[PDB]
Design a protein around this ligand. Structure first.
Ligand SMILES: [Ca+2]
Length: 223
């Protein structure tokens, strides 16, 4: 996260770190056994880390659970990042408490202008490189469809939305991928892509979760 702030330990209790020997992507806990992330975060040998603040120190509230199964969206396109969504099942159920908690799925899609909370352990620099140890947060608004498509002509599907600041300086970045965008208490987005981070006229692009709620529900009911 570029130009964000320190969240505060366990104030975002649905935030997970995906670990394959090192943190590489975020995710969201949506019930005691399931995590939503980005399909481009796919890899084998995922361990899901819940209750994290400092991802390099064991602070006492963590739960480390291996994934039993990953399921990339059937229509995921790795060229365009259309349908950039994946489900991860945990080998055992997480214990839910004040520090580990699920986030609700949306019943209806979010509206342009709505302020949302984006979080992760990704790069905090615009052009350089610095990765944080504690969880970073950012408030950012959903941008109109028209301004999104203007920023990224010929690249935006109806399964994507833009959020952020056209003036630049505030954005998600690499290492935040797969993490949450939470608006009005619902998971509305997944950190997907962007042209650089925090650049003028290049806002963040997010997977539009409300288009996938049927697929998530049926997949969880069968696996
Ligand atoms: Ca930790």
């Amino acid at each position: 996260i570029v130009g964000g702030y320190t969240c505060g330990a366990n104030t975002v209790p649905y935030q997970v770190s995906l670990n394959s020997g090192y943190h590489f992507c975020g995710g969201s806990l949506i019930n005691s056994q399931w995590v939503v992330s980005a399909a481009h975060c796919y890899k084998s040998g995922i361990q899901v880390r819940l209750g994290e603040d400092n991802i390099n120190v064991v602070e006492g509230n963590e739960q480390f659970i291996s994934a039993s199964k990953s399921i990339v969206h059937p229509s995921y396109n790795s060229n365009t990042l259309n349908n950039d969504i994946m489900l991860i099942k945990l080998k055992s159920a997480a214990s839910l408490n004040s520090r580990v908690a699920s986030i609700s799925l949306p019943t209806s899609c979010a509206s342009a202008g709505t302020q949302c909370l984006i979080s992760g352990w990704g790069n905090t620099k615009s052009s350089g490189t610095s990765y944080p140890d504690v969880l970073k947060c950012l408030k950012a608004p959903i941008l109109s469809d028209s301004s999104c498509k203007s920023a990224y002509p010929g690249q935006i599907t109806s399964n994507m939305f833009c959020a952020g600041y056209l003036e630049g300086g505030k954005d998600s970045c690499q290492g935040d991928s797969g993490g949450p965008v939470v608006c009005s208490g619902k998971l509305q987005g997944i950190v997907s892509w962007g042209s650089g981070c925090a650049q003028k006229n290049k806002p963040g692009v997010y997977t539009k979760v409300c288009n996938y709620v049927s697929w998530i529900k049926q997949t969880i009911a069968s696996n």
